[PDB]
Each structure stands twice: as structure tokens, then as C-alpha cells.
Ligand binder design. Structure first.
Ligand code: HEM
Ligand code: HEM
Ligand code: HEM
Ligand code: HEM
Ligand SMILES: c1ccc2c(-c3ccc4c(c3)nnn4CC3CCNCC3)c[nH]c2c1
Ligand SMILES: c1ccc2c(-c3ccc4c(c3)nnn4CC3CCNCC3)c[nH]c2c1
Ligand SMILES: c1ccc2c(-c3ccc4c(c3)nnn4CC3CCNCC3)c[nH]c2c1
Ligand SMILES: c1ccc2c(-c3ccc4c(c3)nnn4CC3CCNCC3)c[nH]c2c1
Ligand SMILES: C[C@](N)(Cc1c[nH]c2ccccc12)C(=O)O
Ligand SMILES: C[C@](N)(Cc1c[nH]c2ccccc12)C(=O)O
Ligand SMILES: C[C@](N)(Cc1c[nH]c2ccccc12)C(=O)O
Ligand SMILES: C[C@](N)(Cc1c[nH]c2ccccc12)C(=O)O
Lengths: 352, 353, 341, 345
């Protein structure tokens, strides 16, 4: 019957280590670590792609409409963030290689680079990094480096629906936004307008003081920010600039989930939103730890005469944060008592 | 020109994932995680073997005699412990699989098991786990599973010099033990004997009391422990039982390094000893985390035949599997600093770089 | 104006470090690390108690009956396990102290011990460690080591409802167990009986066969044992189990129907309770390994004894893995009744 | 007899938790976590200061001259980095607080901020962050927020010798730099010059491939030869783009290249550890940024944007140790150190 090594195809996995230093008659011990570290990253990238694809499919094929499937969705997205955390920690292993020792085999690698990781690109694309928003390296598209079936795979990855698009569509259907129903947006605008009015009166009532002056200034900022939320044209503009990514309606859905997270139907949805932010934060942390290591190994100016260091530093940016809108919902937090009430009267549609 | 995927042989690594659930017409999503997790463990086991073999070779071929090589030795042993820590954390990934989901593909795995990891066994053997100390599973030898070249490799792993044996030989050469020289052992025995004598007199002077008895009783325990160190015959006996692993002379070398760790020639040696203990501790932590997960997935009774896997694995979390137990137990023989034989520059020339 | 240091009462927190080595005219550098490490453990124990008490209260006052409160419950229990993981990692700091350096100030500590952590005991009791199940230290009860108000607090901690008891009561009310309703237990027994019957027949149709026969026999005994309420009561008496038979039924209902909307967050709670038990055990294990490294080959053997199912409060949740069946044996839940969850 | 609680002064530590939400008649559960998290950070900052001060003192009092003390030095610096790692992981606890829940007690905190952590500033100063290099927040000096004894302490922290300065002095005394002795710098310049000559010949002996090699050679040549420009170094020192004296830089490179030599093994570990502390300090700052973002948004001079600015070489004290990787050469170019000339090492 089945044996461990055969089941795991270890005849492949453990016969995939060839030191170029050794192939060229000058074996360097630490090259082995370099190979294994990358192979382990690639195994885990494959696992992340497997989870991510399964979740994309749940959205894309309509299964997510049945809320029974939310546990699996959140459990798999949580699993992705648990793997990503391990991948961040994994840099600690390669940090046991000194720059001096790396320098003894670096020449035998040229011109290969991590830039050519198919899976890393697939992962970026499938989460929803927009091609127009990528920073070019040496004034080139990232995919220009790939050919054949690999280029085909990358194209599919760009053309098929991303996790961002699939979550967007689902957020747009969030219960409670219906004007004929709970009319979340209408009530929210009204309550925020009234809340600001009340606050203005409170501040104006205060005795002339430095404190008052500050409160006035703060109020003015807060007022502008909160009212700006209801400007759909500003949203479209920011969407155009890439400072936002979600449709206006999806943003409404996300805020509905945020404010009514304790309501039973929104509990697991809220966890999903939290998890999407976690993935974005951990992807950025991966990129940051990668940058620090490139610096430690090559210096601040080495790279393909573009500085790899500086290109990579540019990737550590909201430009590569797909669910940046979920983070920015913090900007629009209001006092709890301003949140449109959901009494049992109307608290029927958010029970399981 | 060399390309990433070719250099890393990703055509092998990323085409090694076959779900038995799918091969048998009933694909179960979480099986993929189970495969990848194990493959990642095995890659890192290969890396640990590569580091450990390189260090064994440095000892075995005499390179360690040139102390310029101690930095490399300690850096590679430190690297092994950094990998082991990652491997302990890696269980957190498999903990995202529920027992209920594992149960949907478990049947398609039988009768394969992690028990059949060649590399894990190679690692245990090369560090220095003794075959006669291993606990039998279902009243069977661990090697009974393996056949052909695999069984051959395991035998070599048992017959070749282990890390423990190679460190032992090097410890036996530790400077300072020469009776004609610094005479560490003789001076230590003398100072401990005198120190105990002095302490006894202090205690005896006290007036008969419960407190005095307690002090007297404590002194007697401490006395027995410390003096037991100089009983070479007791050591040989305990070595016979497998309760100790290092030769008496190697034990002397280790304690020399412990007590004179700050002396320049002993600084990196001390770090090495620390690192060997770290590896033992992390190997045990791996075993423990593995146990907790087997329990969560299979329950306390599930296992091959009437034997419980859980209970066998629990049994592996024991000093029986701690190769450098003697290095840990040197803390038992701590004395006041002023009892430590002095090493004035006059007699320090030998421990300078 | 509120200032950081005043808000955090740093005049207290950062003036609480007194080296006994220094008080006795022989300052030892590493003693400072020993003090801070323990103070950090105690701050986090206080936080764990704060979370755990808030959750006990949500159960005890009936708030948990409104399922709107489940997110907060699971979020706070998850928070406890996140803190416990940090506390496990925190041992890595104290591991930078050698045994030789510890030995230079150890004498000045006597006769104080970590054993006397009030908060650690409060935490054990509030989770649900039973006093009669504790391993004796020096042939005596753990509480004998405490006096005054502290002894009083520990008694309250034992007498007040534990997390285990409060979860138990909630599990007993789990929807689906009603014989007049979905009749989970009845259907489960029936389906397991049938499933075993079917398997036997297949088996009856070789070395392999012998093995499968053996397996079947073990599985059969185990699965049928689940329906023996008397054996359960006996094991409860021996302390080998902790939850009532009815609570066990509730937990299995949640396990099997975890995807059903009303059970999704409850399942996360059960998962989290096991996590806390596992991390508490890991804390105890890492503590043992450190004591060994510091003192040698005994407190060591008493501590080793605490790394046991004896101190696993939610051991019943772990052991439900033993009673997993093929998915197709699980009583079906369709719209006919599905709506109840 | 001493009791645990008394020894640890738990009557202070465990009676230091006062929720402002509760003081103002509206207790918010998560405020307790916010307080404890910060108190735990501050305990560990105290420990880091205690280790760092002990190491500064070993340098400053001449004890480091006795190489017996290098193990203690490196062990304590390693300990600092192990604590810093825990402090980075500790953010995972505060991340279990949602922004919505933080928003329920945030108002009761105003106008307090982590910016007012005395110990964090003391730590920055004692490692060697320069005041003139700090980025202003809201067009203000960082110390403007401190008064009394606290401001006094911060002054001393700036005036007293920093870890950077103490390491610098020790690096300047590194064996091997003597022109009358092993003459490291002279030999290195000579070997690099010759090595470049040899490579040029190979290039001349040879297309776009050749052209690429030509371009590379030119870049490498400029970089490597720039190392021997003492004047450029002094200029960059003036700007604050470098921190170590030219002589200290030579000492560091000596240790780098001859790390395996017994006398340099633990010194090399020290240099590695100093870089680790810089990396971990930056990682702390970055994890802090990500959290502030999640909690306040990108707008709430935005704190988020100021903090992002602190993740920069501007705050990297041992940047020179990192940048020595730029000046790596083939091993065979490194001046040989035969036992003959090894006795000193
Ligand atoms: C010695 C360690 C490392 C060095 C020196 C290094 C160097 C670099 C450099 C210079 C680049 C920029 C592209 C180029 O100029 O060729 C790059 C990009 C990249 N590296 Fe690494 N790398 C290291 C480790 C790793 C590891 C362990 C991974 C894991 C898979 C990795 C994955 C990547 C990826 C995916 C990119 C492209 C990132 C992007 O375009 O945003 N590298 N690396
Ligand atoms: C679902 C997760 C896991 C389960 C249920 C599991 C189960 C078991 C069981 C029952 C045994 C005892 C042997 C037997 O009865 O066949 C065992 C041993 C073993 N497992 Fe696991 N295991 C799991 C994950 C892993 C992983 C991730 C590794 C990593 C390589 C691993 C490596 C091993 C090894 C090396 C042994 C032999 C250990 C020894 O003999 O001391 N297992 N496992
Ligand atoms: C040098 C480090 C440590 C040593 C040598 C040590 C030693 C011991 C010993 C010997 C015991 C058994 C009781 C006794 O005989 O006194 C004990 C119990 C205990 N220690 Fe530690 N300990 C250390 C660190 C810590 C730390 C950092 C904590 C954190 C709070 C801690 C908490 C405890 C607790 C709570 C107990 C009672 C455990 C139980 O009864 O299950 N210890 N310790
Ligand atoms: C809810 C979590 C947190 C938020 C929202 C937060 C927010 C901020 C903000 C906005 C700043 C910029 C200064 C200001 O605008 O007042 C800041 C700075 C700072 N925070 Fe935090 N913080 C948080 C947690 C922490 C924690 C856990 C620490 C640990 C002690 C901390 C320590 C600091 C320090 C030291 C600074 C000054 C850093 C520098 O000047 O480079 N904060 N924080
Ligand atoms: C496999 C193979 C190589 C890599 C690298 C990688 C990327 C860039 C590197 C490098 C290694 N060594 N030096 N550089 C800089 C380039 C600059 C242009 N000229 C050639 C060297 C990362 N991961 C890998 C996996
Ligand atoms: C690859 C393949 C299998 C494994 C296991 C593993 C070990 C024991 C297992 C198991 C999986 N599932 N059930 N058991 C218990 C046996 C007991 C005898 N009857 C059949 C099931 C761990 N790692 C692996 C890697
Ligand atoms: C504060 C003060 C002391 C401690 C300890 C602790 C516990 C036991 C210790 C110890 C330190 N040093 N030696 N022992 C062994 C004892 C055991 C009982 N019989 C006498 C020797 C842990 N945490 C602390 C906090
Ligand atoms: C103790 C007390 C407060 C803090 C903070 C902190 C920092 C900035 C904060 C905050 C809490 N709540 N809101 N803000 C935004 C302010 C920034 C300045 N302009 C007005 C809004 C961090 N650690 C602490 C410890
Ligand atoms: C029926 C539904 N699952 C409704 C839905 C959409 N988005 C949501 C977010 C939270 C809660 C529910 C929803 C669907 O249309 O998918
Ligand atoms: C020359 C020598 N390296 C001496 C030696 C042996 N063991 C040691 C431990 C610590 C310090 C030195 C030694 C050798 O024989 O290997
Ligand atoms: C009304 C109820 N919340 C029902 C209940 C009890 N235990 C459960 C477990 C999972 C799901 C629901 C329940 C209550 O009685 O608390
Ligand atoms: C005697 C000496 N410890 C020499 C010294 C200085 N820097 C070094 C770096 C590495 C090795 C030795 C040194 C001292 O002057 O401190």
C-alpha cells in the first residue's frame, strides 16, 4: 500500500536541490540554504493559491450566497494569513546567511531572480493588484519577463475575476442598503448631519478659550471628513486616481457590516473583512522584510543600473494594498449613538 | 541564462502534489494542506541534515582543531536551532485544519504515516539518539518499517559517528584538564572539599534547632551531590544504564568550559554547548507540539492496532530522547564562584588567542 | 491635560524593581531581568483574568442567550489565546539568563516562589481546574500556601461558577437535542448502528480482512460506548470527564452542524476553549523545561505532573475526535427542519 | 521570609490600572487591554535600558579592553534583540482590539500619546539617534513635549556618550590597522587596484554582454575606489549620511574580512548584533505604523504619514555596518593573514 515518501512524492521534492556553485566546480555550503528557503516559500505560495482559488470559486459560482458557506470562507482566509505569518518569520532563517557568504555564490545565480516567481505574481494578481497601479522595474511590465504557458497563466490571472472584484460584488448585495428597506445610507447621512449640528451647538456654547478654538478647528475637520463620505462624485474621482478601489455601493456594504457586526448575520462577514485586511498587512510585511534583507545582502544601490532596493521599497505602499478601503473606514467612525438604531422592530432581517 | 524556476527545479517541487482523495474520485480540499505541510517539513529536515553533516565532518576530519573554524561551527548549529523554531511554529498552520475535515480524507492515507520519515530518523540518529533507548511502537523496532536502500541508509546513520560522539572526543581534548598542567579536576575537588568543611563548621556552631537540622539536611544533600561528581565509578555505571552519555573526561571538559566561559578560548565553545542544548530542547518541543496535534486530530486512543499513537508519542517526550542531557545536568553541580579554581594571567597564557 | 506616564501610572509600574542582591550589598545584573519578566507575566495574567471574568459574567447573567453577544465572547476568548501565545514565547527572554548567572542571586529569593502567584491560581480556578483533581505539592493542598484575603479570594475562585460550568449549562440548551424536535441523539444512535452494520457486511465479503475486522471491532466499541450514559456518569465521578452527558451532546451537535449559521460562531468558541487548554499546557511545559535548565536534576517532578490531562479542563472537547464518523452517517438537516439553525 | 508578591512589588504593578472611561462614568472594556499593553512595553523598555546602560558602562570604564568581557557584551546585546522581537510580536495582542472598539474610549485619552514615552526616547538617544536628524512632527522638536526632571534626563541622554560613539572608539583601536603592522588599509587598496586591473584585461580580451560587463566594471570600480576617499567620507559624515569615523569604518571592515580569526569571532557577533538591534527597532516602528493606520485611518500632519517617515535610514544608527556589504570583494583579493602575521589575532 501507500508509503509516506511516495505519497508526498519526495522523489521529486528531495531531488530538486542542485547548487550552481557545485555544478561549476566550486561548491559553496550556504547555497543549499538559499535553494531550500526559496523552495519552501514556493510550496507555501502554492498552498495560498490553492486556498485563494477555492474561495474565489465559492464567490464566483454563487455558493457564497448560501451563508452556510461563510465559516469555510473565513477559515480559509484565516489560514492564508497564518501561512503568511510563517512566511514572514521564515526570513529569520535566511538572515543566518552573512552577506560575505552570499557573495561567494551570488555570481553563479545571474541572471535569475525572485522577480521571476510565477506564483508570487499569480498571488498578487488573484488578490487584485491592478496592472495599471504596479510600479515598473527598469521601465518594463512585470509579465514581459515570462513566456509560453507561464505568460498564458499570468494573463488568465489578470483577466479572471480577482478576490477584490468578487468581494466587491458580494458587498454590493449586503442586506440593509435597500432604500425601501432599512435605508442605511439615508439614515446615516441624516444622523451624522444632526450629530454634527448638536456638536456645533455644544462647542459654540463654551466660553471663549484656547480649548474652544481647538475644538472648533477639530470640528471643522471632522465635519468635512464625515460629510465627504456622502459625496459619490468625490468617490468616483478617488477611484479614478486609485486612492480607492471599491465601488461606492460596496463601501456602503462594508460600513454596514462594520457598524452592525454584532448582528448574527454580520458576525462572520465582519471576520472576513478583518481577515482581508490581515492578508494585506501581512503581504506588506513580507515585502518589507524582503526589502530589509536585500539591503543587508546587496547594499542600497545594487540591482538590475536600477536599484532593486529602491524599486522594492516602492512596493511597500498602499499602491499594493488591495483592500486599502477597508483600512480607511476607520476615518469615518462616529459615536455609537449616531449609528442608525436597529431595534427588534427592524432587527429581523439580520437574524439567522 | 539561468531562470528562477529552473534553478530551483520547481518543475519537480511544484508537481509533487497528488491528493489521494482525488485519485480515488472524492477530492477533499484540506488534503492539499496536509501534503504541503509535510513537504515543507521534509525540505527543512534536508537543510538540517546538510548543516549537521557539515559540522560532523568538521569534527571528524580534524578541522575543528583549528579554532578559526569555531565561528562557522556555532553559526551552523545556531542556524539549525533557528530552523527548528520555525518548524515548531509551522504546526500552527496545520492547526487550521479541523479534526472533522481531516477525518474526510484520513482513510485514503492508510497505511502511510509520518513514522516513515527517513529524514527524521536520520536526524535523530546523527544527533545521537541510541537505538537501545528508543521506545517500541506496537512492540516493534522503528527500522522494521524501512527496507532496501532506505534501511541501509538508516544503518549507516546508526553506525557512523554521531554529533554526540564527535563533541565528546573534542571535549576530552579540552585544555586545562592536564594533571601536570592547570589540573582543573584536582583543584576543583580540593576546593569543594575545603568549602564543604568550612560550611559544616559554621552550621555545627549553631544551637540545636529545627532550622539547624534543615540546614544540616540541606548541607548533606549538597555535599552528596557535589562529591558524587568525583566518583568515576558511579559515572561509568550510569553510562552503562544510559542515564548519562558523555565519558567522564568529556564531562570534565564541559565543566571546564562552563566555569571558564569568559576566557577568550572558551567563549565560542561555551556558545556551542549552549547551542547543543538548544537543539535538544527544540527537538523535544517539536515532539511535544506533534503530540498535541495528533491528540486533537485522532483522539487519545486512535493508533496502529491496540496501541495508542498519542500515548507512544507522549513517551518520546522524555530524557530518553535527550542526547545532551549531561550538558543540562551540569547546572546540578554549580558551586559558589569563589570555590572555582582561580585562573590568574600567570596560568591564563593557555586560554588566550 | 492627561499625560502618558500618569495615565499608565508609570510612577508605580517603573518604581517596582528592587534587586534583593543589591538590598543585601551584592548587586547581580541578571536579577533585574528576573523581576521584569515576572512583572510582565503578572500584567498579562491580570489582562487574562479581566477578559475571562467578562466572559463568565456574560454567561452567568444570561446575556449569552442573545446570540448577538457571541462575536464578543469568541473575540475575547481568542484574545486570551493570543496573549497566552505571547506568554509562551516570553520564556525565550529568560532563557538568555544562564544557570550560572541565576545561581549568583538565587539565594536572595528564598523562600519566595512562582508557586505563590495568586493570579495564576485564580486563572486556573476560574477556567475550571478542580481542587480535588490537583496534584499535591509536598503532600499538601496548593491553597495552604496562601493566607488572609488571598486565601479568601482563592476560595471564592473555587466556589463561584467556572468557565467550564457556565459553558456546560449553555451547551445543555443547544438547539436540536429535543426528542420531540430534531432528535439528534436518537437519529445519531440509529445511523451509527446502521453504519456499523453496513460496514460489517462489506467486511465479511485475507491479512487485510483480519486487520479491518480488528479495526471494526475497536471502532464499534468506541462508537457504541458514546450512547452509554452510565459509563459517562462513572467517568465523571472519576474525574476523567468533566461535562455532563447532555452538554456533551450539545458539543457534538455543534461539531457536526458547525456550518449551519447559528452554529458557526459557537463552533469557533469550542475551538477557542481547546486552544486555551492547549496553550496553558504549553506554558506549563515550557516552564518545566526552563526550571530544569536552571536548577538541574524536585519541583521539576511536581511540575512535570501538572503537564497532564488532569489540568485540561476542556478535555471532553478534545476527545470528541474519537467519535468522528463518516459524513454520510450524520443525520441529515434539510429546509424541512434546517430553518431552526 | 520574602514572598513573591512583595519581592515583585505587585502592590504597585497590579494597582496601576485606571480606566479613564470608568473615571468619567462610562467604562469601556477594551481600555484595560490598551493600558496593560503599554505597561508591558514600558517594563521591557526599562529592561532594554538596563542592559544597554550596562554595556555602555563596560565600554566607557575600559572593561571592554579586556577581551574576557566580550561574551558578556554580546550576550547582553543578543538579549536586547530577543526582547525587541517579543515587543514586535506583542502588537498581535493589540490587533485583537477593533478600531470600532478603540473609538469608544479614544476621546478619554486626549491629549496623551505614545509620543510622550520617556523611555522610548531615552532608548533612541542612548543607542545614538541624532537630534538634528529627527523628523519633526507638527513642526516641533520631540523634546518640547517633556518638562521637569524628564526633560533633564533626556538632555543627559543626548549629552552622554551613545552606544554608537562608544563602539566607534573601540573600532578605532581594532588591531591590524597599524601602517607599521599588518597595514590593512594599504594592502587592501593595493589588492583592489590590482584586482580591477586584472579584470579590465579580461574585459579588453573579449557584444552587449561585453558591454554590460564594461558598464558593471565601471560601477564596481567607482564603488570600490570610493572606499579610499577619506574626504568623501568626512563630507558624508557632515551631512549625517554616515555616522562612524573613517578609522572606525576601517576597524569594522577588518573585523568583517577576518571574522574567522579567533580574536575577531565574538567582535563579529557584536557587529551582527548591533545591526540586528537597528533592524528590530525599525520593525517595531513599522508594526506600530500598520496598527495606527488600522485604528485611526490614513488622515488622523497625519500621524500615519509622520510615522511612515520614521521608517528610514535617518533612524538607522549603525547604517555604516549595513553598508559594508556594498564593498565586498572576491575572497582572493583580501590581504592574506598567515599565522606568521596572525600571532596578534
Ligand atoms: C539573499 C536573499 C535575497 C536577495 C539578495 C534578493 C534580491 C532581490 C532583488 C535584487 C530583487 C529585485 C529584482 C532584481 O533586481 O532582480 C528581488 C525581488 C524579488 N525577490 Fe528577492 N532576494 C532575496 C530573497 C528572496 C526570497 C527568499 C524570496 C522568496 C520567494 C524572494 C522573492 C522575490 C520576489 C517575489 C521578488 C519580486 C518582488 C516584486 O516585484 O515586488 N527573494 N529580490
Ligand atoms: C493531521 C496531522 C497529524 C497526525 C494525525 C499525525 C499522526 C501521527 C501518528 C498517529 C503517529 C504515530 C505513528 C502511527 O500511529 O502511525 C505519528 C508519528 C509521526 N508523525 Fe505525525 N501526524 C500528523 C502530522 C505530522 C506532521 C506535520 C509531521 C511532520 C513531518 C509528522 C511527522 C511524524 C513523525 C516523524 C512521526 C514519527 C515520530 C516518532 O516515532 O517519534 N506528523 N503521527
Ligand atoms: C529561573 C526561572 C524559574 C525557576 C527556577 C522557577 C522555579 C520554579 C519551581 C521550582 C517551581 C515549583 C515550586 C517550587 O518548588 O518552588 C515553580 C513553580 C511555578 N513557577 Fe516557576 N520558575 C521560574 C520562572 C517562572 C516564571 C518566569 C514564572 C512566571 C510567572 C513562573 C511561575 C511559576 C508558577 C505559577 C509556578 C507554580 C506552578 C504550578 O503549581 O503548577 N516561574 N517555579
Ligand atoms: C491603538 C493603538 C495605537 C495608536 C492608535 C497609536 C497612535 C499613535 C500616533 C497617532 C502616534 C503619532 C503621534 C501622535 O499623533 O500622537 C503615535 C506615536 C507613538 N506611539 Fe503609538 N499608537 C498606538 C499604540 C502604541 C503602542 C502599543 C505603543 C507602545 C508603547 C506606542 C508607542 C508610540 C510611540 C513611542 C510613539 C512615538 C514614536 C515616534 O515618535 O517615533 N503606541 N502613536
Ligand atoms: C534564485 C536565484 C536568484 C535569486 C535572487 C537574486 C536576485 C538578484 C540578485 C541576486 C540574487 N544576487 N545578486 N543580485 C543582483 C543582480 C543585479 C543585476 N546583475 C546580477 C545580480 C533572489 N532570489 C533568487 C532565487
Ligand atoms: C503522510 C501520510 C500519513 C500521515 C500521518 C498519519 C499517521 C497515522 C494516522 C493518520 C495519518 N490517520 N490515521 N492514523 C491512525 C491510523 C491507525 C491505524 N489504522 C489506520 C489509521 C501523519 N503524517 C502523515 C503523512
Ligand atoms: C520570585 C522569587 C522566586 C521565584 C522562583 C523560584 C522558585 C523555586 C526556586 C527558585 C526560584 N530558586 N530555587 N528554587 C528551588 C527551591 C524549590 C523549593 N525548595 C527550595 C529550593 C520562581 N519565580 C520566582 C519569582
Ligand atoms: C496612552 C494614551 C494615548 C495613546 C496613544 C494615542 C495616540 C494618538 C491618538 C490616540 C491615542 N487617540 N487618538 N489619537 C489621535 C490624535 C492625534 C493627535 N491629534 C488629535 C488626534 C497611543 N499610545 C497611547 C498611550
Ligand atoms: C444572500 C446573500 N448571502 C446576502 C449577502 C450579501 N452580502 C452579505 C454580507 C453580509 C451578510 C449577508 C450578505 C448574498 O446575496 O450573497
Ligand atoms: C586544539 C583544540 N582546538 C583544543 C580543544 C579541544 N577542545 C576544546 C574546547 C575548548 C577550547 C579548545 C579546545 C583541539 O584539540 O580541538
Ligand atoms: C437561545 C440560546 N442562545 C440557544 C443556545 C444555547 N446553546 C447554544 C449553542 C449554539 C447555538 C445556540 C445555542 C441560549 O439558550 O443561550
Ligand atoms: C585591547 C583591545 N580589546 C583591542 C581591540 C580594540 N578593538 C578591537 C576589535 C576586535 C578585537 C580586538 C580589539 C581594546 O583596545 O579594547
Amino acid at each position: 500500500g501507500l508509503i509516506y515518501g511516495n505519497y508526498l512524492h519526495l522523489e521529486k521534492v528531495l531531488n530538486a536541490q542542485e547548487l550552481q556553485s557545485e555544478t561549476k566546480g566550486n561548491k559553496i555550503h550556504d547555497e543549499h540554504l538559499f535553494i531550500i528557503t526559496h523552495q519552501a516559500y514556493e510550496l507555501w505560495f502554492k498552498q495560498i493559491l490553492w486556498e485563494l482559488d477555492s474561495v474565489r470559486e465559492i464567490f464566483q459560482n454563487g455558493h457564497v450566497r448560501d451563508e452556510r458557506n461563510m465559516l469555510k470562507v473565513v477559515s480559509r482566509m484565516h489560514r492564508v494569513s497564518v501561512i503568511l505569518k510563517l512566511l514572514v518569520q521564515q526570513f529569520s532563517i535566511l538572515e543566518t546567511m552573512t552577506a560575505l557568504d552570499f557573495n561567494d555564490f551570488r555570481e553563479y545565480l545571474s541572471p535569475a531572480s525572485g522577480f521571476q516567481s510565477l506564483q508570487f505574481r499569480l498571488l498578487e494578481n488573484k488578490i487584485g493588484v491592478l496592472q495599471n497601479m504596479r510600479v515598473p522595474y527598469n521601465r518594463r511590465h512585470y509579465r514581459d519577463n515570462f513566456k509560453g504557458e507561464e505568460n498564458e497563466l499570468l494573463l488568465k490571472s489578470e483577466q479572471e475575476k480577482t478576490l477584490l472584484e468578487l468581494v466587491e460584488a458580494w458587498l454590493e448585495r449586503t442586506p440593509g442598503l435597500e432604500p425601501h428597506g432599512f435605508n442605511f445610507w439615508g439614515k446615516l447621512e441624516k444622523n451624522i448631519t444632526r450629530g454634527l449640528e448638536e456638536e456645533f451647538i455644544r462647542i459654540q456654547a463654551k466660553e471663549e478659550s484656547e480649548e474652544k478654538e481647538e475644538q472648533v478647528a477639530e470640528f471643522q475637520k471632522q465635519k468635512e471628513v464625515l460629510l465627504s463620505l456622502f459625496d459619490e462624485k468625490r468617490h468616483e474621482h478617488l477611484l479614478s486616481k486609485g486612492e480607492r478601489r471599491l465601488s461606492y455601493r460596496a463601501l456602503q456594504g462594508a460600513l454596514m457590516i462594520y457598524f452592525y457586526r454584532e448582528e448574527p448575520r454580520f458576525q462572520v462577514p465582519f471576520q472576513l473583512l478583518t481577515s482581508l485586511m490581515d492578508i494585506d498587512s501581512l503581504m506588506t510585511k513580507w515585502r518589507y522584510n524582503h526589502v530589509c534583507m536585500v539591503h543587508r545582502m546587496l547594499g542600497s544601490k545594487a540591482g538590475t543600473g536600477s536599484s532593486g532596493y529602491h524599486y522594492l521599497r516602492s512596493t511597500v505602499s498602499d499602491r499594493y494594498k488591495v483592500f486599502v478601503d477597508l483600512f480607511n473606514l476607520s476615518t469615518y467612525l462616529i459615536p455609537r449613538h449616531w449609528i442608525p438604531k436597529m431595534n427588534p422592530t427592524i432587527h429581523k432581517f439580520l437574524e439567522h
